[PDB]
Structures are given as C-alpha cells and as structure tokens.
Automatic annotation (TrEMBL), chain B:
Organism encoding this protein: Caulobacter vibrioides (strain NA1000 / CB15N) (Caulobacter crescentus)
Listed name of the protein: Flagellin
Boundaries of the shown chain within the full protein: 111 to 164 of 273
Subunit-level organization: In C.crescentus, the flagellar filament is composed of multiple flagellins of 29 kDa; 27 kDa and 25 kDa.
Gene designation: fljK
Domain of life, source organism: Bacteria
Function: Flagellin is the subunit protein which polymerizes to form the filaments of bacterial flagella.
Family statement: Belongs to the bacterial flagellin family.
Compartments, record wording: Secreted; Bacterial flagellum
Amino acid sequence: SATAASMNAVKDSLQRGQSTIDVALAAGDTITDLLGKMKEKALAASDTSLNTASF
Amino acid sequence: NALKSDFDSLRDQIEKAATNAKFNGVSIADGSTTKLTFLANSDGSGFTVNAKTI
C-alpha cells in the first residue's frame, strides 16, 4: 500500500508537466501567427518598384 | 517662321507631357530607371517590366 500512496504522489507531477506544455503551446501559436505576418511584410518589401517612403 | 514656332511649341509640349507621367513617384515613361520588378510569387520571384522611355 505504500506504493499506491507513491502513485498518488506521481500523478500531480504528470499534471504539472501537462500545464507547462499548454502554456508553451499558447505562446507558440501566437509566435507562428507573428511569423506569418512577418513573411508577408518582407515579401511586400522585396519589390523594386516601391517608393522610398514605403520601404 | 510661323510654322517653325508651331513646331517648337509642340516639341516643348511633348517634353512636358512626357515628364509629368509619374504615379506614386515611379514611372516607366520618363527614362529614370531601366526596369520595374513587381511581385509574382509568394516566395519573392518577380514579374519584370522593362522601361520604355518615350
């Protein structure tokens, strides 16, 4: 029965790991959106017919 | 002399009409630059339009 108590101790650590990964995933989604937008900006600026004040 | 002065007026007109044809400061009829490159692909590859000075 001591071992069953220890399993009770293990489950919380597994849950904490889940939580940390969720936070990381949220930040990652935001970062991927920002990277898409940055690609759009760089692509738009790669144009050689552009004015000096839009670059 | 009258025909010569008419000729000279029309030449000055052509020059004015040519140098005023700019959109957003960039133009392909004055002769300022050799070509204009626009975007044509989501990776940067371009659509090239040479300059036709008039």
